[PDB]
Each structure stands twice: as C-alpha cells, then as structure tokens.
Design an enzyme around this catalytic site. Structure first.
Site, PDB file in Angstrom:
ATOM      1  N   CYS A 164       0.823  -1.205   0.000  1.00 18.67           N
ATOM      2  CA  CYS A 164       0.000   0.000   0.000  1.00 18.67           C
ATOM      3  C   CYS A 164       0.861   1.260   0.000  1.00 18.67           C
ATOM      4  CB  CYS A 164      -0.930  -0.014   1.209  1.00 18.67           C
ATOM      5  SG  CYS A 164      -0.048  -0.383   2.737  1.00 18.67           S
ATOM      6  N   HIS A 166       0.918   4.961   9.778  1.00 13.79           N
ATOM      7  CA  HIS A 166       0.137   3.907   9.147  1.00 13.79           C
ATOM      8  C   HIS A 166      -0.876   3.338  10.133  1.00 13.79           C
ATOM      9  CE1 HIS A 166      -0.673   0.372   6.604  1.00 13.79           C
ATOM     10  NE2 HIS A 166       0.019   0.971   5.653  1.00 13.79           N
TER      11      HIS A 166
HETATM   12  N1  LIG Z   1      -4.221  -4.318   4.558  1.00 16.01           N
HETATM   13  C1  LIG Z   1      -3.203  -3.541   4.191  1.00 16.01           C
HETATM   14  O1  LIG Z   1      -2.936  -2.505   4.778  1.00 16.01           O
HETATM   15  C2  LIG Z   1      -2.342  -3.959   3.035  1.00 16.01           C
HETATM   16  C3  LIG Z   1      -1.984  -3.026   2.068  1.00 16.01           C
HETATM   17  C4  LIG Z   1      -1.183  -3.433   1.010  1.00 16.01           C
HETATM   18  C5  LIG Z   1      -0.774  -4.761   0.941  1.00 16.01           C
HETATM   19  N2  LIG Z   1      -1.130  -5.646   1.885  1.00 16.01           N
HETATM   20  C6  LIG Z   1      -0.678  -7.032   1.758  1.00 16.01           C
HETATM   21  O2  LIG Z   1      -1.798  -7.909   1.582  1.00 16.01           O
HETATM   22  C7  LIG Z   1      -1.519  -9.187   2.173  1.00 16.01           C
HETATM   23  C8  LIG Z   1      -2.724  -9.653   2.982  1.00 16.01           C
HETATM   24  O3  LIG Z   1      -2.911  -8.777   4.096  1.00 16.01           O
HETATM   25  P1  LIG Z   1      -4.329  -8.667   4.851  1.00 16.01           P
HETATM   26  O4  LIG Z   1      -4.382  -7.317   5.524  1.00 16.01           O
HETATM   27  O5  LIG Z   1      -5.424  -9.102   3.902  1.00 16.01           O
HETATM   28  O6  LIG Z   1      -4.128  -9.775   6.007  1.00 16.01           O
HETATM   29  P2  LIG Z   1      -5.294 -10.710   6.624  1.00 16.01           P
HETATM   30  O7  LIG Z   1      -4.689 -11.414   7.811  1.00 16.01           O
HETATM   31  O8  LIG Z   1      -6.581  -9.931   6.784  1.00 16.01           O
HETATM   32  O9  LIG Z   1      -5.497 -11.786   5.442  1.00 16.01           O
HETATM   33  C9  LIG Z   1      -5.014 -13.118   5.585  1.00 16.01           C
HETATM   34  C10 LIG Z   1      -6.076 -14.096   5.110  1.00 16.01           C
HETATM   35  O10 LIG Z   1      -5.456 -15.196   4.445  1.00 16.01           O
HETATM   36  C11 LIG Z   1      -5.882 -16.435   5.024  1.00 16.01           C
HETATM   37  N3  LIG Z   1      -4.749 -17.402   5.041  1.00 16.01           N
HETATM   38  C12 LIG Z   1      -3.693 -17.372   5.877  1.00 16.01           C
HETATM   39  N4  LIG Z   1      -2.833 -18.396   5.625  1.00 16.01           N
HETATM   40  C13 LIG Z   1      -3.341 -19.111   4.600  1.00 16.01           C
HETATM   41  C14 LIG Z   1      -2.941 -20.319   3.831  1.00 16.01           C
HETATM   42  N5  LIG Z   1      -1.794 -20.983   4.118  1.00 16.01           N
HETATM   43  N6  LIG Z   1      -3.758 -20.730   2.832  1.00 16.01           N
HETATM   44  C15 LIG Z   1      -4.901 -20.079   2.538  1.00 16.01           C
HETATM   45  N7  LIG Z   1      -5.322 -18.982   3.194  1.00 16.01           N
HETATM   46  C16 LIG Z   1      -4.605 -18.454   4.221  1.00 16.01           C
HETATM   47  C17 LIG Z   1      -6.400 -16.094   6.415  1.00 16.01           C
HETATM   48  O11 LIG Z   1      -7.522 -16.904   6.780  1.00 16.01           O
HETATM   49  C18 LIG Z   1      -6.839 -14.649   6.297  1.00 16.01           C
HETATM   50  O12 LIG Z   1      -8.245 -14.586   6.032  1.00 16.01           O
HETATM   51  C19 LIG Z   1      -0.287  -9.010   3.047  1.00 16.01           C
HETATM   52  O13 LIG Z   1       0.786  -9.754   2.466  1.00 16.01           O
HETATM   53  C20 LIG Z   1       0.023  -7.521   3.013  1.00 16.01           C
HETATM   54  O14 LIG Z   1       1.428  -7.257   2.942  1.00 16.01           O
HETATM   55  C21 LIG Z   1      -1.903  -5.277   2.917  1.00 16.01           C
END
Ligand SMILES: NC(=O)c1ccc[n+]([C@@H]2O[C@H](COP(=O)([O-])OP(=O)(O)OC[C@H]3O[C@@H](n4cnc5c(N)ncnc54)[C@H](O)[C@@H]3O)[C@@H](O)[C@H]2O)c1
Ligand SMILES: NC(=O)c1ccc[n+]([C@@H]2O[C@H](COP(=O)([O-])OP(=O)(O)OC[C@H]3O[C@@H](n4cnc5c(N)ncnc54)[C@H](O)[C@@H]3O)[C@@H](O)[C@H]2O)c1
Ligand SMILES: NC(=O)c1ccc[n+]([C@@H]2O[C@H](COP(=O)([O-])OP(=O)(O)OC[C@H]3O[C@@H](n4cnc5c(N)ncnc54)[C@H](O)[C@@H]3O)[C@@H](O)[C@H]2O)c1
Ligand SMILES: NC(=O)c1ccc[n+]([C@@H]2O[C@H](COP(=O)([O-])OP(=O)(O)OC[C@H]3O[C@@H](n4cnc5c(N)ncnc54)[C@H](O)[C@@H]3O)[C@@H](O)[C@H]2O)c1
Lengths: 338, 68, 339, 338, 338, 21
Positions: free
Chosen positions: C156, C183
C-alpha cells in the site's frame, strides 16, 4: 530563601507539574502554595490523585476541603477566577506563577499575573510576540534574572531542540524538516465539534489529524543561527500520551548512521545527560510513559543517504517529560532569582 | 462595532419617542427616520461572531490551540 | 477471447476488499472470480464479506452461502480450504490467475506452488521476495511482460509514494529521499502483547505507536529504477483501523517552492496521473479518505520547501481499498495483455 | 520441599502469573523452573520485561540466552514444542504445570502433561468435561490432593462468584442475570478476520462485541446450590484490560441497597478479605489496573427494587487479578500436595 | 405554510437532525431555515459535510457564505449568539426551535426562545422540571398542541421505552434494572479534566466510565404505570457511536426466551414498526451505524430464568436513531400545530 | 531457534505475520 509558587490552570500540565514537584520536593527551591483553576479543590484533589495516564498517586495522601488542596500535610490554597488580574497573588505573596492554562501566552495576557501581585511568570507553552523562550539543556543558561515573563517552549520543541543542537554542532545543519506523530491533547474535540481549527474539530480518538506546529520554527528561537531553516507539521494520532519526532536534515559535513548515533550517544552521557536519552531497544510508545528525558533517540531508526541527508527519530512523554523541564526551568530561576 | 451599538440605541430611542408622543407623532417619524439613517450607513473583511467569541473566551473548547 | 478465471488465496482484509472492488466494477471487467481458498469456511467468509467493520454492509446484491460456495447475487464462487497451494484444485477449476493475498507466499518458490497446482499466473498482493517483477499502476505497470508468470503489485505505501516520487523526480530531479508512513495498524500486529518475529509488531496495536521497517522504501527504487538506493524510511503504526498518510522529504536538484511543488502534482493528478494521484486543498482527516479510489491524495496544505531544494510532501491513502483498487487494475491489465 | 512449576503458554496469563510469582517469590512454596511456548527465550524475556499494560518490570533484572530466561539470576529453562507429550517434564523434575495456552482445557488434552512427566495440571481457564473447577475464596478449600487436573475458571467467574456467595448466603439467590462489560483479549481479532465466533471475528478495538462468558456456567460449578439459576453474556469493548460485571439477582430475603452494601463490605473485611474489596470512590476502569482483589464492589452503583431485585457492579483486573488467583490456587495445591 | 424551524446548537444531534431532514425533506411538513451556534456558517458547513461517523454528505452539495449554510440550493440563515433571548426568531418567522445545545433543558431556559419570537421549543434531551416528555411510538400521541415546550427524552429512553412498553403489555413489568453500555459523547473529556461528574471527567477513549442514564427516570415518564419501578446506570466505553442497553425485568406472567422474542418480533412488524427492529443476526456495533430504528433487539441474547426474570438486549445508534425521532416528534408537532 | 524453525513452517500464524507495509 524559598520561592512561593502558584499554578494557573490545573489541567494535564498543571497536574503533571504538581506531581513532578511532589516527587522532587526533597531537594527543591520551590514551594507550591496556591492554585487557580476553573474548578474546585475537591474536584481538583480527585484528579490530582487519580490520573488515567499516571495512575494513583502513591507518595502522600491527597485531600481537600472547601478552599484547599492538601498533599502530605502541605496546604495549597485554591481560588477560581478566569481573569488573572483578580487573583490574590499579592496577598499570597506568589513569587513565581506557572502559566498552564494555554490562554495567557502573550506578554499582555501573562502580565496580568504581575498586575495581581506576582513577580515572574513561566508560560508552559510557546510565547507570542517577543517573549524569551528557553529549553533546559539548549539555551536555559542565557536566562537573564531580570526577565519577568518566560516561555518553556512546547513539548515538541523540547524534544527536537536538544537533538538539533548536537547534530548541528557535529555536522552543521543547513536545513531541517520535522513531523511529530503526536498523541492527542485537550485542544482537540472528542467528537466532531465546533473549533477554530477545522482539523482540531474532528474526533481525536478516531482520526489521524494534521495540524500546524511551530516547534520547528521555535527551535530557531533557541538555536538562533538555525532561524528560518526548520519547518514541520504535526500528525495527531489516537494515543493519550507519548509522542515521537521525525527529523530529516541536510548537513554540511558528510556522515553515516553510525556516527550520528555515536554523537548523540556521547552527548546523552556528557553534555546532554538527563536531557537526551539514547536507546537501542526495540520499544514502543507505551514503554516511554513517565520518562524524565526531553528526548529519547531511537537508535535503530537512524538513517543517512548520500552522506548529507540525515534522519533521526526521538520519543518523548509530552505530558511528563515536558513537565520535568518546566520544573527544571523554575528550579533554575529560583537559583538565579536575581 | 460603532454603528451596531448606535442602531440599538437608535431604536430604543425611537420606540420611547414613538410611545410618548403617539404613533402619528412627527417625533416618532424622525425617530424611525434616524434609525433608517444609521442602518443605511451600516449597510452601505467579514469578521465572524465565532472569532469574537474566541477573543473573549480563549479557553473554550472551540478555541483552544496547543502548539505542540 | 474469453474471461480470465481468478481465484483468491487468502480471503482476508485485502482478499475481501479486492472481492468487493471487483463486485462493484464487475460490469466492466475481463476477470471473473470463480474460486476462494482460505483457512475458514464458506459461511464464515460470506458473513465477513457482507458485514465489514470498515466498509459497512455490502448492499449492491445479496450475499449467501452453502457448504461449497459463496454467492454474491446468484453468482457462485467455489470455496476450498487447504493450507498448501500445491494441493489446491486450480487445475479442475480452470484458474488462470491467482491473487496471492495470504502474506505467506511472497517468494517465487512459494508463489509458484500455485503454478504446480495448475494456475497460469500469480499476482502477489505484497512486495515479492527475491527477483519478482514489481509493478505500480500508473508508474510502471505498462512494462508488464505477458511472459511473467509471477508478479508483485507492491505494498500500500509503495503505491502511495511511488506516483508522487515519479512526478517530483521528473519535475525537479530527486537525489535522495526519506519517508515515514504514519500507518493504520494491520492484521500482522498483535491485539495484545504477544509473540512475534518483530518485537515491535508484538505489542498491542490499538494501544501504541509502533515503529516498524517498511519495504516501500525499497520498492519505489524497483518501479523507478534510477532511484534505486536513493530512498529509505520507516513506518509508524498507530491506533487507527484503516487509512494511512506518507510523509516524504526529498533533496531535489532543481530549485522550487511549495507553490510550485503543489502545482506540479496538481497538473499530474489531472492528466498523466488522473485516477492515481488526487489533489486536495481541503482540511480533512483520515476518516474522510475512507473508500477513496486514488493511490495518493496529496494534502496540498502540508507542502513545505526549505532553501529551494529540500521538499516535504504528505499524501493520504486508504491502505485497504485504494491498494485493492490497484490490485484490481493490475489484474485487469494482465487480463488485457494475456499470453 | 519446593514444588517445581512449569508454564505452558507464555501469554498474557502466563506472563502476568510469572510477574505475580516474582513479586511474591520471597514467600512462596512454588519454584518456576520451566517454560514452554511457541516462541524463544529472547523474545519472551523481552515481553516479560516490556508490557504495554503492566509497564516495565521493576523488581528484578530480566535477561535471556539461547536456553533460558533469567529473572534476577533465577534461571527458567525454556523449550518450544506444541505437543505436551514431547515436553521434558520428567527430565526437568516438573511437578505442577500451569496450563495457559487455552488449547489443552479438556482432561485428555491437559493429560498430555502427565504423560510427559508432570504430576498435576492447573488450567488457567474453564475445563472441558469433568474437571474440578475452583475459585479461591468460594470453593477452593474443597480441593482434594487426589485431583491432578484442575480448572481455576474464567476471570469473570472469579469476580462474580465471591459476590454471589455472599449475596446468596445473606439473601438467598433464586435467579440471576449477568453481563460483564469486558476488555478485549487475545482471543479476539484486531481487524475483521475469521473466527469460530462470528462476533469475536470483528475488529476488537472498533466495536462493542456481545459474546459468551464462562461465568454463566462456572459460577454454578463453584456454588453448586445455584446450578441452573444463573445466566448472562459478555460485551467486549475497546479497552485492553480491566472489566466490570453487572449482576441482577432475584433474591428471597427482601433488602435495600444500604443493606446489600453493608453485607458485602463486612464480608470484604473478614471472610472475603483479599478476595472482595469494597470501594466507595467514584473511579473508572483505569484506576483498577493491578488490583490484587478478585472483585471490587462499586457501592455507589448498588440499587434494589421492590426488595427482591438487586443490582451490584464489580470491577476486576481480568489479567492481574485473575493471575493472582492462579498463584493462590497453585500455592494451595502445593500446600495440600499428593 | 410549512413550519419554519431553527436549530439551536449545531452539534452531533443538531447536525444529525439536519442530515436526517435533508434525506426526508421531500415528505416533511418542516422547513429548516435558521441555525444559531457557537460557530460561523463556513465552519458549520464544513462539519455538516465531513462527518467522522456519518461520512461525507452525499445527497446534495453543501456550501456556505458569511450568512448561510446552503444545502443543495436551500438556504439556512446563521447567527452566533449564546443568549437565546437575543435571537432573531421574530424576524426570521421561526415557529419551532430544536433546542440541541444541552444547556437549556429547564423550562425557563428553553423559554428564552419564546421571548425571542419562536412559538414552540423541542428539547433534544430530558427536561428539568415539569416539561412533558415524549417517545415516538410509546406516548407521542398524548402530545397536546397546547404544549409549547417539550422533551424528546434521551437516546437510551428512546431505545428502552418501546421494548419496555411491549414487554409490559405482554407480561407485566413489576421491576426493572438497566445498564446501557454506551458510546462516549461530547459531554465526556478527551483526557482527564474537570467536570461536574467525577467519572465523566476521565479520558473517554481510555476508560469504562460508569455514569447516570436518563432512561432510569424518563422511561417512567412516558410509561406512567412504571414510574418508580425502573432504575439503572450507564457504562461509557471507548466507541464513538452506537450503543446497547441491557434490561432485566421482574415480570408477572411467566414466559421463556422463545415467547419474549416472538412478542417483540410481532410488535416490530405491527404496532412498533419503524421504532423496534427485530434482529436474529450475529452482528456487532459497527453494523448498526445509521440504523433508523430506535431499538434493534438482539434476539440471540434473550434469556429468561425462572419464568419471571427476563433479560433483553437492544442496539441503537444514539446519534442517528435518536435524531430520526427528533424529526418524527417535530413532524408530529408540525401536524398538530393547534 | 525453535521460534525461528516454527515461523518457517507456518508464516500465517499471528506469531509470524510480516506484511511489509
Ligand atoms: N491491509 C493492508 O494494509 C495492506 C496493504 C497493502 C498490501 N497488503 C498485503 O496484503 C496481504 C494480505 O494482508 P491482509 O491485511 O489481507 O491480512 P489478513 O490477515 O486480513 O489476510 C489473511 C487471510 O489469508 C488467510 N490465510 C492465511 N494463511 C493461509 C494459507 N496458508 N492458505 C490459505 N489462506 C490463508 C487467512 O484466513 C486470512 O483470512 C499481506 O501480504 C500484506 O502485505 C496489505
Ligand atoms: N500535555 C501536552 O500535550 C503538552 C505538552 C507541552 C506543552 N503543553 C502546553 O501546556 C498548556 C496546558 O495544556 P494542558 O494539556 O495541560 O491543558 P488542559 O486543557 O488539560 O488544562 C487546562 C486547564 O487550565 C484551566 N483554565 C482554562 N482557562 C482558565 C482561566 N482563565 N483561569 C484559570 N484556569 C483556566 C482549565 O480549567 C484546565 O484545567 C497548553 O498551552 C499546551 O500548549 C501541553
Ligand atoms: N486474559 C484474560 O483476561 C483471562 C482471564 C482469565 C482467564 N483467561 C484464560 O487464560 C487463557 C490464556 O489466555 P491469554 O489471555 O494468556 O492468551 P494469549 O494469546 O496471550 O496466550 C496464549 C499463549 O500460549 C501460547 N500457545 C498457544 N498454543 C500453544 C501450543 N499448542 N503449545 C505451546 N504454546 C502455545 C501462545 O504462543 C501464547 O503465548 C485463555 O484460555 C483464557 O480463557 C484469560
Ligand atoms: N449525543 C447523543 O448520542 C445524544 C443522544 C440523545 C440525546 N442527546 C442530547 O442532545 C443534546 C445535544 O448534545 P450533543 O451530543 O449534540 O453535544 P455537542 O457538544 O456535539 O452539541 C452541542 C452544540 O451546541 C453548541 N452550543 C453549546 N452551548 C451553546 C449556546 N449557549 N448557544 C448556542 N449553541 C451552543 C455547541 O457549539 C455544539 O455545537 C444534549 O443535551 C444531549 O444530552 C445526545
């Protein structure tokens, strides 16, 4: 022989200050003898003892009656008038007024304490107009005993200014930018509500809130040859105490992160001891609650690019740290009372 | 301001003059003529009542500013 | 000719934001989300997809579930729950593109387990580990090569900083640059002090200012190669649940002033960066930028310049929705250049 | 001699318990000699020292190496295995396992510690199935040395059950409804994420979250007379620690608020000393951080209607108070060992 | 022949009301033409549009000049006088004043608007002294056009009273206790600061703050039969909007949770439609933002003990739902001017 | 390390999650 002190405004700074002096009373030249505030001694004795940030006061019994707050048998008379000209400073023989309301930070405003009978006024905030500003550790020695009204700057200025003095003397600061990611304070509305600052109007605990700060320019006040060379902003964030300054400077002399850290570290042990603390621990804001230093350098965050763009990050307990400096500045004044 | 504190003293003086001498009085006519005169000068940089309240009650919740 | 079949690996904050981005934009899309893999079950993920604490209740269409699928207006999304992508049924489901949104497969070797499972391409919703081509829509996505089977859409913060850094660098020539992102906290921080490989992320998130090491500092040098090794910075996680602000201090070569810095980014926001950078002179706060579709919203009121060459700009971004909007953009872009 | 203790799960309870023990070590029959946790000794020594809620640990110096956490020269051997059967309990001479992972709360689950070599297990939560449940000050004097797997019930149970016992013995409780307005816990989600409980799945610091409370069932296990006669719920709110239980009971002997308060107060100064504390102060949740009592009655909130509908309101530090009781239960078990 | 309306106090309630009427403007017999407030029109226009809770106003553009707020081409004239007596109600032809400052809740206080020219005053809070109180859906049909000063009670009263009326008419409430776990409001303090209520003085986003609730006494005002038979308190918690009341009733006709829920469900589809909403969903407080009902019964939490002890739990958007009722009451008055 | 050998197998545990933000 003993400088009689009175607090004007018994809010977060008035009460932190009061609790600082109560713990430093053994070796102190100050006797807090009176409080002016919009509220009453019963209400204010309660707040004094039960602080959501500092916890229950443990050192001495805090009591109060119709007109007095008592702390460990020591009586503190209380009045409640919003015009400092009506205050009984002459009667009470007040020598030093701590101006912690945030309202009387111009010369004319503060001078009303002198009209009521006080001798000197230490404003717990940036001054307006030509009020001499001081930061203990940076310029508090140029204090002139003939000064009747002084400013102890802001919390942020007290955190940046000592780091700026060390860096500037080591590598010569040419220009500097700062952002303070700051806990909210009482000037912000709890929910979206009327205000003269449209950003301070927004709910403090729900939002990141940019606000103009002067602490950057205010640093040029106390380090007078960096005047006009610093600027910055504030980001108010939903924490109730403890803030962190982010300072980005271009320096004349090329350096690297390690040298920057060693410089500040050596100052923290010698010239700036008690004022700057140097930390390589991976802590967060909660861990710095009640820290007595104006600045705590977070050494793991220091960065340098191209030898001349330096980045440093310093924590500070904006409530309790600043109050220790307010007390320091007063203890100093009591030393050179004239 | 100046013209405001005179428009309230001008209708206070015009309502007293009007009641004493009557509604058809030539004095009541001049009293409202003199009020219309100071309202034509009053109407002929837009500071707000908000900003004047923060000058009178600087410590209000709507007016605090902590330069941190 | 037909549409790209998408699966979501990881139905979390990003996976579910992306789903709702797609569901809103579905009328114009070469994509079709046909599968989810997540640790949880279809009924539970249907509930969360509809009832979001940050986006409110989804209302564009009805959202239900049974044991196999989630339904969004009668449109069926098949749901499987296996923790090893190797075992996922991408072959039987005809999955063309995988949105790797679990945070667990940012490396090419882990990310390409989806390719062992039958997937044809993989879009990592995070900075990739090792040499994985990294793209920022509006800065760099036009260099996408249809032969890339594994891509990274970035972080992000990278999607916020990078468009601005590109305009500033070309206008005034960036020589060095520092960054700090105040953040919102995210799911990888602990709710109360608990174990973690990052001793700072281990601390109670809604209770602390938490400095951590962001890679947006590194990423920006990827999508703008001439600034590789010229930028650096940190992150300060704070107690808001969504919306971030990035503060950039840059040493430029061509002298300027705050008025001119703002005008440049404003002109960009209206032409070459329309839809990516937004220009605001309004005195708003974080809450006001919930759901904003731009990558960066320049807070024009906060621009300052010292000595003509030290430039400070501050930009907002919805770290969940904005980033999800770009993920979608990048995926559509790949769908258009598919081979 | 000394009952050698191991902590399984170095979480909020596991580490509050340690800090409880360290403060009471100089007077204790227990000796904490081992820790099992998903994490390593260095991380866990860092967490033990720096605590967002308890502050920096003052009493003793804390350190670590690859093998152990050191709390003032006291060495605590650390292992990191998630199947209790593989744990070196026999090799470490471990007698009592403080089970605090929250995942081995059934008898067969907790029993894995016995196969690994331990001799008794104290579960820091309600048990699953026939596991004797004890609350200190209510029924713990019924504990039997023959029982090797025991539950110390929930935090809410430990707050409500001392008050119910008093109320019941003084007025006779026929029915009772409970609602604990409750700080969130590690069990909840920081942001909306999947969870067995669709409401604890929702961002904890953003929402009021209605959920279940163990006290609804556990109180009836420690006051058998009242099995089936109590019920209630939890509302989880955006505070990290300290909670308050609202208890509305239909009682048999008609009474009034003054009498309800005087019964709990006298109990607090005699048979419930240390367990129940009686407070008349007008305090808020922050002020009860670190209270050692299981329940603090807020007498200003007591009210009664028609003599038979009694409302009482009791605070508790769900982390520190509950951990104090876990230590008490442990000491009691080491006293009555077999 | 609209009913010309002025809002006194353009705060949370005053601006929710304005936005409520803007959405419902088409069908309304009211016309909002004037605002008096601490702030100027530009600041109030800004806050009306950008709301941390409600989000940016979508329906129509909102501008402002020195004289008026503009709601999509509709002009609302603005003044800034804190003494209602000086207000231009006569000149502006003001029929109904929505008294939403919070500081004119006595009859003499609210009557200053009548001296200024208004014809009737609707206080958006409980009244002090003999002021007829009303809840839409409970007793607003007993409104009498001779009443020129009225109270729409509090937000908790508007949530609780409709469920009490339904319960009372089905089973017969003999006694009742209430606890609203309540989002904090501008009445509380961001950080510990003086306040006539020693608990509302304490930092609101940090604490569970026990306090009073108007519903304790006002429910008996609008349901006269139950006067003196209800009582309770509030626990303010660190959420900025949306609340939940927990009500325990001693009832006469024995029942069970199934029967209670069917009765409230039945009412919510017939006599109480638009006032009570019946919910079987496992939701949390964020999900109820902007909900137009006064009461959302969380059916899953309904429990009964001994046939006679009934416990129900009802959500409410204390800002937006209450404002919806202010509009309803004002429209009702608009329909019954004489 | 045991906690280093545990974050290898299960990066998706809230004891190991690292989202470079
Ligand atoms: N939310 C933000 O601020 C943001 C912004 C940019 C990028 N990101 C990136 O997006 C990615 C996801 O972040 P998020 O905020 O959605 O986290 P989150 O914890 O909300 O999402 C993780 C999801 O993936 C599932 N999961 C975990 N391990 C798994 C596996 N082995 N197999 C299948 N499913 C699995 C979990 O059940 C959970 O629902 C991160 O890598 C992060 O760096 C996040
Ligand atoms: N804690 C911080 O964040 C911090 C740090 C450094 C400096 N400061 C500065 O210190 C000053 C005090 O800030 P605070 O947060 O303690 O404020 P606060 O609002 O918590 O306290 C202000 C107190 O002053 C009293 N007061 C107001 N007007 C008065 C009058 N006319 N007469 C008498 N008493 C009056 C009020 O009753 C209140 O108790 C501010 O000017 C601020 O700029 C604050
Ligand atoms: N915190 C409270 O308010 C409170 C009060 C009373 C009772 N309790 C009970 O105490 C128990 C502990 O909860 P907590 O608040 O400490 O949660 P927590 O998440 O802070 O602690 C859990 C700890 O156990 C470890 N762990 C988890 N699974 C493991 C396994 N299989 N093997 C080894 N270690 C493992 C985790 O690394 C973590 O350090 C809960 O069951 C809860 O019901 C909690
Ligand atoms: N907030 C809720 O959830 C809620 C629910 C039900 C009832 N109420 C009641 O509604 C009333 C409004 O409270 P609120 O929550 O909007 O608080 P608020 O502080 O948000 O609103 C008060 C507004 O009135 C203005 N004001 C104050 N004194 C004034 C004066 N003398 N003249 C003109 N304007 C003045 C303030 O500037 C502010 O804009 C209160 O009496 C409250 O008890 C509130």
């Amino acid at each position: 022989s003993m400088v009689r002190v009175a607090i004007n405004g018994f809010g977060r700074i008035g009460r932190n200050f009061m609790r600082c002096w109560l713990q430093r009373k053994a070796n102190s030249k100050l006797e807090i003898v009176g409080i002016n505030d919009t509220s009453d001694p019963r209400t204010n004795a309660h707040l004094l003892k039960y602080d959501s940030m500092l916890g229950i006061f443990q050192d001495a019994e805090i009591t109060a009656d119709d007109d007095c707050i008592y702390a460990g048998g020591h009586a503190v008379k209380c009045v409640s008038d919003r015009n400092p000209e009506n205050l009984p400073w002459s009667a009470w023989g007040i020598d030093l007024v701590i101006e912690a309301t945030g309202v009387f930070t111009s010369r004319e405003g503060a001078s009303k304490h002198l009209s009521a009978g006080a001798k000197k006024v230490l404003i717990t905030a940036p001054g307006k107009g030509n009020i001499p500003t001081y930061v203990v550790g940076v310029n508090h020695h140029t204090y002139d005993p003939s000064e009747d009204i002084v400013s102890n700057a802001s919390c942020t200025t007290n955190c940046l200014a000592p780091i700026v003095k060390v860096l500037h003397e080591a590598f010569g600061i040419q220009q500097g930018m700062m952002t303070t990611t700051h806990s909210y304070t009482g000037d912000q509305r709890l929910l979206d509500a009327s205000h003269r600052d449209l950003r301070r109007a927004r709910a403090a605990a729900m939002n990141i809130v940019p606000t103009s700060t002067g602490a950057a320019k205010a640093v040029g006040l106390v380090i007078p040859e960096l005047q006009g060379k610093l600027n910055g902003i504030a980001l108010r964030v939903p924490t109730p105490n403890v803030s962190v300054v982010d300072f980005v400077a271009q320096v004349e002399k090329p350096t690297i992160a390690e040298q920057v850290n060693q410089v500040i570290k050596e100052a923290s042990e010698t010239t700036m001891k008690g004022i700057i603390h140097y930390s390589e621990l991976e802590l967060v804001s909660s861990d710095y609650r009640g820290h007595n230093a104006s600045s705590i350098l977070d050494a793991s965050l220091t960065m340098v690019l191209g030898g001349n763009l330096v980045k440093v990050v310093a924590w500070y307990d904006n409530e309790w740290g600043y109050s220790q400096r307010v007390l320091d500045l007063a203890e100093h004044m009591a030393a050179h009372w004239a | 301001s100046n013209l405001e504190k005179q428009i309230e003293q001008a209708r206070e003086e015009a309502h007293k003059i009007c009641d004493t001498e009557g509604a058809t009085s030539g004095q009541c006519a001049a009293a409202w003529d003199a009020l219309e005169e100071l309202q034509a000068e009053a109407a002929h940089d837009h500071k707000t009542s908000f900003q004047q309240y923060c000058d009178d009650n600087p410590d209000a919740a709507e007016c605090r500013i902590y330069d941190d």
